[PDB]
Chain length 501, copies 4
């Protein structure tokens, strides 16, 4: 059984050795990164089922990210397996300012009335809370009375009862008991704070990633198609047109514009943590299911992310709720599941990938019976779409061990993936950009091949590579799909059902 | 293109003797004109006849041999090949001659008369004698309460008692009617043990095989044995290519239909005799059931007899006849047949043209009203998966044509069975396979050189389709085959090709 | 129980005059023997005739009136009620008498002759004159290239030129044939401005309404206005219960089918005239399409003319005719019709019996082969939900009978439209609603006293069904109604009951 | 919007007042339970959506248990809504024995070799752990080499490496660093230890509960139909045949015998806690989905229980994973969701019930598009199936506000509930036992009424009670379904679609 659901693992210090020291050891940050020893740790994550590594530019500097990318390239060589490289942008942020007198935090009681300062370069007082806004942006004009200001992952709520134009301050009433600590995340739901579509930090981070060599960009806090289009303009301008963009839907404006965002993007990353703060908690499961169904309808890639196996950061076993949550992401029809802190900063990065691989493989067995996505609903206009449907019907009607597609661009692999056939998909391609770019599509095993000289040669190569890969053995039935004639840019128009010899 | 195939029975109706047309006096006086007759037969081929039926029920071997030769010339004039089908005489019961050379007698309802079972004797007014094929004694096979029907079921005699001394049936005339000499007799629901293959029929088949035929229609099939005995002769004479259609005409054949379909290559629904042998209201029931069951087995079904009966004497068919041909197509028939309308009628060409027009009109309603259902077939096999995919492709896109390169014709029969909304061009490498596909629904058989590889095979499919005028630049076709094309393998490859 | 209804046309074939039968000498001189004629008509009722058609194309009001009176006696003898349907004459064109009192002339293909439009002149071999209804001048309504068809479409005349000086058409004979005096004329694809309702049809309808009828079949309906003018007379005279069947006989009626179906209560598919007025191969196409659309509208369709035509002179139908009646049932027709077979033939009782047998046998195949599909209807209202539920019960379980108590017949018509796999007993409170349901598919109309509560309604439904002999102890029935049944409300209640 | 998914809340000190002392107050346990004060707290749980309370008879003497039941009866009057009374049996257990010398516990290192004794009535030593087995069974022949012995809710693993026939001891190896304390739960996965059906005290506990008036029994650790049949025999012999039995599926043998258990029982409680210990963690979601489908197919009640909102035991909000877990149990097709520690011993018992109610109501809105149960799948060849299917089709085809049934036994209500119509089900019954017995059926609102005199009266009562309950108003469409005549135990045979006046 091959794992059809792809795993995105976030890389961090958890797998990194410095001067023989492991993360958390005293003096760890005082040593140079040990590249070959760290690469051996990352190869184990590849072997356990990580299909793509996420480089989170929210933390660290470019030199750390570049070294990490170099460590993965060595790990691919050690493991003898390739992975996708995904860049995650920092995006806009609002943080709690510093407190006067060096005070770490203040505890507040419901009904207590305090103020929120929009002026930048000011410290916070227990009475008045100061906001560090990205770009030192003035948000006073963009928050309406009745809005909510939430502090530290939505734990504390301040209702905006009044605005004082005299000091550009928010007059709020505490809604629930809690603590306001310094440098804490702030979210103001259902606001349209005018952070620019593409900030200079995000521009630097994307151009750096593009130069290092990446296959995917996950764009943080996408609110409209423009946030996707500004990034696409950079990929096309720099001659990186192959790079695929995943919009991170984390707030109500993003949900409101989901159809236009899906059209612009190559996929969606569902960020459940931030989405849970920005929208009513009971709607997250609704938005997750709806987003997965719509992205699959568009033949695009969806990643379910954040809070998947979070307890495995500190514990070797996940909770029943966490196992259920990952399992149900697969049944919902996700292409990929993601690990953040569990793989980047946790005590059990290898166990976290292994656990997610085990849940994903188990869930894939129920996809035939309990799977939510339904291929019959699709509109098959293009001949290529018609062929993908026939492949799906073959895998439904007969015991098909593998679907083999010869694809110069990967387009046919993506169309077959979209139908969720009851078989693994071997995508034979001729360049590394296409190979790595298919690493997050459901069920796709990308592999490099030699070019066929004829249609008969192509059928022979398809069976030979499947056997050499260990995917099938004599008596197994496979479906082979290709554009004929084979040399040219002929779209996939041929299907053959073959018994492996 | 007409997807439903037409079988036309040949007879004197199209033959020119000297310079005289059928029905002119002294016609039988004149010698047969081969070239003039072939020109007329060619007109039937252009009109849409796909196979000619040689009825060994009438005429002799010399007569059958001369007509088969005339069709071969007609193929050349027309420039289109047709199938050759032999229809056997098979088992019959006829009324005997009357003593004193009387022609016939009339009877009234309620009269008590007798039917003799003794063979080689003459009838009398009071005692009708039967000429049973093989001079069988049928006295122990007919029970009291059975019915004896004379002259195409017109006059009924109810068996009320049996007389062991004379071995006679005591009968009651059920209706006013006439019993004439040499008229057909039917005893429905009886198992008269006619041999599986009689010597006369064995003889006729061996003669037709010698002349060269593609199909045999076996009259009055009652069990698989009847089909299997003819299969043995075809195999022994090196004629394994011949396809056998069992003619279902009576209750015993209907009761053993599953075993007969398994033994045969197809079924000819003989509505004339079936309407006598079973209740008249059951004929539409058996026609629909047989067409469905034959299509389920992937074999050929012919709907035959009285399709455009009135066109034997009149230039236009009845509303009922048009409805009957049309509904045969809707039921899912591979082929419709003409007997007297083409064999000895006043309008043989008009009958083929009328049948072709109704058949072509009916094929346009198959998508919405068609009674066959391709989704009903088992889909856990490579073959069923490919055919289903091909049918799905023709439904989802506007595919004009399905093309196959087939050594044996299996891919063509497989696609035909699924009844795609497209013509099927079957490119084959021998004349035996080519004429053998002439009665398969939607199949246009064509001869070509075997291809050297899968790419060559794809190129030949597109080239022949364009050459035949079946498709043009920018048209989409589906090419289906068992690769490799030289080997004999299950259909396993499909390609949707945009004709450039 | 026969689900498909039979319309039998009454005529002299069942009527005995002073002990004489139709055709014998001085038959028309004798007064009609009412009791002897009523006994003959009662046998047609017992054989399965559900409605009698009185064709006002032939005879006078006195002959029609005495015939309608005779049926009332036949209902008493049979112990069974029947519907009364009036068929209008409508617009006609007939060839005129010839000079020298010649009866007819024979013509050959390619001959050139003329057709006069002037009214009140005799024909010559060279110049055919017409009797157009109302003495309408049709010269401006017929374009060159149109066809003039004579005698049930047997002889075709192509209009090749128009002479403005004599207002004559120059025509070319298209086929060998005869023009006889007083023969029907059809000019396909023309819009001759016959009134929407001619005075003669107004007189015939008002006469029938006075006598007491349940249905009117309106001849040659071209637009909804033809239906609405008849509806106005029915409402004006207090005969708003009377249901109108539009006869679709020509291209204009087919072109306006959707508006005609909305105006009428049903459609009579007049295959005879339709086969002349449209291409012969399209008649089956229009027949299936019309049956589907009328069923979709929840209205009644009658398939008419030439169903068992040969039974006019012969005691058995052809295989094609049996197939034709059988497939009308499979297409989804509510009713089949007999014209000359029952009105003027030698075998009126046999024709009704043969049609009943075919119809009964065909209904057993509706589940597997029926073209109508109740799943196609939209299901967003209570009435559609209840009918779909009744149908599902008859599909899922072995339901013998659906029983409704209905003031207006709405629940019966709704269930009939869904074609359940069960007979429908419709218990109603008045003879007009009862007779008005006699052409709906599967409905057995019966009179009953209105119930005093829902519990009383349920016991009456079971008690009448058991006493009618429709179901027996342990059979399951479905009871459907608009509770409370005394009011005219939407079908809203269903019960599955095991009969005691 | 009426909550269709039912909530079972476990009773505990968290809502209980003792001598004016709230839980976690010094001298709390010394005080008597306060009936009136506690009833006011429990009433709030009822208003928030609790449909049944779960009682455990092991904590406190019967006098006190009687008091606790009296409080809930008082709370019903206060909230103005009736609730079901569920008793949870202790069931058979293995517990670690006392240690010699009063040692409370010992700690062990991975790879240590110790022993597990099978002899009964003896003390543990550090190197020889003794067991207290229900029924005083000898388990030596029931546990093969290679089996695992788990101590304290699966926290410490002991692998059986060998067996000693002279002492009848298991030689085991410590799998992970941990503690073995006295009186701790022991699990031996994939074994068929033939435990008695009930704990020694369960027979007395059940008999007391039946005297007090309970509607449901949840039978712990059911492995065969035999375990359900023993409890049924107690119910029938005391004249309490109305009591519904829920089998708790906690182990592999229970899953293997699921068909026979569902047949013997009135429902299944999926005990995810014990199941998580006894079967591989990744299979729990598989078994949860299969159990929900099979119980629904049998027209019986399923309860999904354990760790639904566990973090709300100590924190005011649930994790994203917990919200997802509760939501997906509804989509899977569960009749009810259950709270244990969250309502029994937690800091936020009321908030736990409100949060579960919010998630369940939100999830029921997605059942039409994403629900995994498939009513079309059911056999449709009987009158009862035909009628239920017609009601479901009516609610699918039309805007049906309510399905109303008048039922003597509750059969029509359980039949409609099984089909999961897109409407609430108002079940009018004639006795309190039938009314309380329907409290856990999906979407059923049980209500008391007088028997009708005729079919027309039954139709009038159905509409009038619905209007009175405030469930519908004039112009709303309702479906009325019943077995006429409703005075008898007849099969559902009548349906009417009625516009409310």
């Amino acid at each position: 059984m091959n794992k059809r659901v792809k795993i995105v693992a976030t890389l961090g210090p958890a797998v990194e050795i410095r001067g023989g020291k492991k993360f958390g050891e005293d003096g760890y940050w005082g040593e140079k990164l040990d590249v070959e020893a760290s690469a051996k740790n990352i190869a184990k994550l590849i072997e356990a089922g990580a299909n793509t590594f996420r480089f989170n530019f929210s933390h660290g500097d470019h030199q750390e990210q570049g070294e990490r990318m170099a460590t993965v390239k060595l790990a691919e060589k050690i493991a003898g397996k390739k992975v996708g490289f995904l860049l995650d942008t920092k995006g806009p942020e609002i943080r709690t300012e510093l407190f006067e007198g060096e005070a770490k935090e203040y505890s507040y009681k419901t009904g207590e009335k305090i103020r929120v300062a929009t002026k930048q370069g000011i410290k916070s007082t227990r009475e008045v809370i100061a906001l560090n806004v990205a770009g030192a942006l003035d948000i006073y004009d963009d928050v309406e009375v009745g809005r909510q200001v939430l502090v530290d992952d939505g734990k504390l709520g301040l209702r905006v009862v009044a605005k004082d134009d005299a000091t550009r301050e928010f007059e709020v009433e505490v809604e629930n008991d809690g603590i306001i600590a310094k440098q804490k995340g702030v979210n103001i739901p259902n606001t349209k704070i005018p952070f620019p579509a593409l900030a200079e930090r995000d521009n630097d981070d994307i151009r750096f990633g593009l130069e290092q060599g990446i296959n995917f960009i996950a764009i943080s806090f996408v609110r409209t198609a423009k946030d996707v289009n500004e990034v696409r303009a950079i990929c096309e301008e720099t001659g990186n047109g192959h790079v695929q963009l995943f919009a991170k839907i984390e707030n109500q404006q993003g949900i409101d514009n989901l159809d236009e965002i899906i059209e612009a993007a190559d996929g969606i990353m569902i960020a459940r943590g931030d989405m849970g703060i920005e929208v009513p908690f009971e709607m997250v499961p609704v938005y997750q299911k709806m987003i997965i169904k719509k992205v699959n309808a568009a033949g695009k890639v969806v990643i379910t992310a954040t809070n998947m196996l979070e307890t495995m950061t500190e514990k070797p076993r996940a909770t029943r709720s966490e196992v259920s949550d990952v399992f149900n992401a697969v049944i919902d029809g996700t292409d990929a599941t993601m690990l953040s802190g569990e793989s980047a900063n946790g005590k059990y990065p290898l166990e976290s990938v292994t656990t997610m691989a085990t849940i994903d493989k188990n869930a894939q067995a129920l996809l035939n019976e309990y799977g939510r996505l339904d291929s019959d609903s699709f509109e098959r206009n293009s001949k290529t779409e018609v062929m993908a449907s026939a492949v799906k019907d073959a895998t439904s009607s007969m015991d098909i061990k593998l679907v083999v597609t010869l694809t110069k661009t990967g387009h046919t692999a993506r169309l077959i993936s979209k139908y969720r056939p009851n078989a693994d998909i071997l995508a034979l391609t001729f360049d590394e950009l296409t190979e790595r770019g298919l690493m997050l599509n459901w069920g796709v095993i990308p592999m490099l091949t030699d070019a066929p000289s004829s249609t008969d040669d192509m059928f022979e190569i398809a069976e030979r590579k499947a056997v050499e890969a260990g995917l099938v053995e004599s008596g197994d039935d496979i479906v082979i799909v290709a554009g004929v004639p084979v040399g040219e840019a002929v779209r996939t128009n041929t299907m053959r059902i073959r018994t492996v010899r």
